[PDB]
Design a protein around this ligand. Sequence first.
Ligand SMILES: Nc1nc(=O)c2ncn([C@@H]3O[C@H](COS(=O)(=O)NC(=O)[C@@H](N)CCC(=O)O)[C@@H](O)[C@H]3O)c2[nH]1
Ligand SMILES: Nc1nc(=O)c2ncn([C@@H]3O[C@H](COS(=O)(=O)NC(=O)[C@@H](N)CCC(=O)O)[C@@H](O)[C@H]3O)c2[nH]1
Lengths: 338, 335
Amino acid sequence: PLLAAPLAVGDTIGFFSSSAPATVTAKNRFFRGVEFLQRKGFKLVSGKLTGKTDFYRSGTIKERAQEFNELVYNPDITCIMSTIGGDNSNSLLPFLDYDAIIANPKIIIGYADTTALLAGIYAKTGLITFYGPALIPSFGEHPPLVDITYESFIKILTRKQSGIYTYTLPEKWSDESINWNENKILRPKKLYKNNCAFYGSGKVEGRVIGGNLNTLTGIWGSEWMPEIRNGDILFIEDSRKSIATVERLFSMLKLNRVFDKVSAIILGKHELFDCAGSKRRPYEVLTEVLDGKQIPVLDGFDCSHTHPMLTLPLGVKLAIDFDNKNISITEQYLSTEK
Amino acid sequence: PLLAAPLAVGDTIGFFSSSAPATVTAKNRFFRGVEFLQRKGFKLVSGKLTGKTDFYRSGTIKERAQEFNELVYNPDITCIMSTIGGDNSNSLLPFLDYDAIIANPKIIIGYADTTALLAGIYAKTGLITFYGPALIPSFGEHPPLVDITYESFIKILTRKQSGIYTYTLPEKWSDESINWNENKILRPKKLYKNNCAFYGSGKVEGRVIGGNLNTLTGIWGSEWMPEIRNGDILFIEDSRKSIATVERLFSMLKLNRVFDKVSAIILGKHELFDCAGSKRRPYEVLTEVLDGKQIPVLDGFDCSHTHPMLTLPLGVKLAIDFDNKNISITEQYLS
Ligand SMILES: Nc1nc(=O)c2ncn([C@@H]3O[C@H](COS(=O)(=O)NC(=O)[C@@H](N)CCC(=O)O)[C@@H](O)[C@H]3O)c2[nH]1
Ligand SMILES: Nc1nc(=O)c2ncn([C@@H]3O[C@H](COS(=O)(=O)NC(=O)[C@@H](N)CCC(=O)O)[C@@H](O)[C@H]3O)c2[nH]1
């Protein structure tokens, strides 16, 4: 794969708004996230749509593509980070400068709707991009959880690329929809013990592919959807969905023969899943849809809309040890030097 | 294509619940729809999941597939009609009896989430199915709008198959969210003049394909999504979506090169579209997404979640005359 140069303390991070204009609509949280990264020593470059609104989005399709391309063209930038998702980054895909991305590989990171860009860029260029923090939701989170998110971000992106990397499991997590865009918390979030489950045995190693599953529907079938291959590990997460929607999306995968190919599935923790009173969890729905197909599942990986969030390279090999209950990156995902 | 026998007054209609359990959750409206069709002379056969609930759905994936298949196996049934949509009919697709459908073609009709079945059945069998009334939302509607829906249903499904059929535009329509499952009516729905628009010139004729666009995402890429081909007319409608979602869905089509293939697009009226204060309509969003491509568009066809609803065969040729502002079925669609 095509690899970006690694991150280092003091580097420049550029940020872009490919969908929702949250630098305006969540401006307090945005400022807290900016301050958070600056205090860590990063220099920030604001994308040209910062502070702008076009109702539900930051700008026209072309304006948003331009905003992103301009960061790619900036030789001082090591990391290009989403401000926040939304619904609309898939629109940009015909207009991104893929040749410039190939010529100037950078760390591209975000999650949620930004999946369309992460997956589409990988499909077009082979660049290893990252499912991980977006500036506003992730780094504007109040302590204590933001510190755990940051620890994963800095570890994954700065560590020496030698030997496998085994993830640490956050001790506590939350998905509550509070403390969003004000100076002070209303009250502390509920902190849940980590209930991640490893359904299976032995060790499975394969290329990880995926992201936000609902968002993948916006690129599905196109040249921007990376082909899923035999032996891949499917990584999928969703946020604030009804069980009805989750069944629909899992069945979409089934119809597409995805479950005939993949050797394991990672379900990110689902933020505020709505079980419609059934008390069922997504894994149970997946099990019905699988119709007897035995695939080991890591249910509840902390790389999703829940806090804290780990950083995950997409398109490289991972190894899930279902017996020892751990997950590791086993393939180089950044260049050894800048 | 594979064609079902035409409907006749007095025939048996079977109904199924492939997703939301609205025979329970909208029981009053359900009874109204049943009574409406019975009064027209139809016999009704209730699918085996009628009156059942599994929280958000009528039953397990396999039980819902069985419910549908059992209607196919019933020799007395000439029309299989959805009760209502939901989110989950795509789950049934691996389990439908496509061979039985081929062996005994029937009129299969519904809309919204049921698109997954209409499209999937067409993909597997070539059967011409129908985007049109579902029992509860469509036939449980109060007069006067239900009468216009029924007039289209009966005209399309019973007419002799000779010469083209040209649609008649409803004079008024509504998308107002009232009088759903209440027993008496607060008042009549607000009525709007028909603002349907023909953007283009000349006449375009091609096979119509599509349905509820959001629902198509649940079958996209699979063997159950019919291939869109050069010359097709794309028919798409959505309901109660944000402009953000509509942009996403239109861009999905663009990324899939759909707009390089289609000869025209029909947008069904979008029930209670949420423009996020932009005052933009779906057509304006489509225009941005198209990035200059000159595709003629029939904007606001009455075959969607709005009332009244016309009945549309899927998979046969239509002709849209943009100069004379009309739309016709030009290919035989029942035996
Ligand atoms: N309390 C609160 N108020 C907000 O206005 C708000 N806007 C965003 N968020 C949180 O930010 C997170 C990321 O927002 S997002 O715009 O990046 N989300 C997305 O792109 C996907 N949720 C869209 C795809 C999908 O959900 O299917 C969400 O999980 C919310 O928890 C908010 N939370
Ligand atoms: N006013 C009103 N009150 C209700 O409680 C209610 N419950 C359902 N409905 C209407 O039924 C109609 C059909 O619902 S459905 O389950 O058949 N719809 C669908 O499957 C699609 N909306 C799914 C695809 C999508 O929307 O993305 C919709 O237009 C709703 O407005 C209601 N309308």
